[PDB]
Amino acid sequence: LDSFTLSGYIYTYENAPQEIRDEHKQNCEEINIDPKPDDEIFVPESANLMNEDNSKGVYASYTVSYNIGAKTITIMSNEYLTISTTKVIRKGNSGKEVKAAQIMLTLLGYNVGIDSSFGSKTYNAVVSFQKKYGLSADGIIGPATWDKLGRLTDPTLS
């Protein structure tokens, strides 16, 4: 029940804990783009931070709904982030699809920063995930990888 919910705090890059700022910094440098002060980063409670003050952040709790027939995945909190499982994302991309994948990978235990940028950590996690589940390990999230992520993170699905 509780293992399908991803809770934590949303920070802006300027407000984020320094360990999170450095992770985001290195992530943006890998995709050769500059981080901006208003970049959102979601830090799950499972993440090991020594001296994190939640006051600078905003609490959020995410769950996943995968509509197989509609080929869509919805990330649910107070807001609803929906993406098409026909979209292909890979290292270098940034946006809501990347965020959705990061949230799902984090629920399955992968260590990726949830900042909407597909850098090296996301790539490694995707390859690992693909190897674990018998998918081609090309590091690209396409239809087959979205489907597997969706089935594993939506509790109503087998």
Ligand X SMILES: N[C@@H](CCC(=O)NO)C(=O)O
Q: Which helix (H) or strand (E) holds 44?
A: strand 40-44
Contact 34, 28 (CB under 8 A): yes
Residue 142 interacting with ligand X (CB under 6 A)? yes
Task: Choose the binding region for ligand X from 38-46, 62-70, 78-86, 137-145 (rule: CB under 6 A).
Answer: 137-145
Residue 138 interacting with ligand X (CB under 6 A)? yes
Residue 20 interacting with ligand X (CB under 6 A)? no
Member of 70, 88, 95, 96 binding ligand X (CB under 6 A): 88
Please tell me the distance from the alpha carbon of residue 143 to that of residue 6, in angstroms, as a whole number: 23
For 138, list phi and psi in degrees, rounded to 5: -90, 0
Residue 58 interacting with ligand X (CB under 6 A)? no
For 39, list phi and psi in degrees, rounded to 5: -70, 130
Q: 3-state class of 10 per DSSP?
A: strand
Task: Choose the binding region for ligand X from 64-72, 76-84, 112-120, 139-147 (rule: CB under 6 A).
Answer: 139-147
Q: Which residues are at the interface with ligand X (CB under 6 A)?
A: 88, 136, 138, 140-145
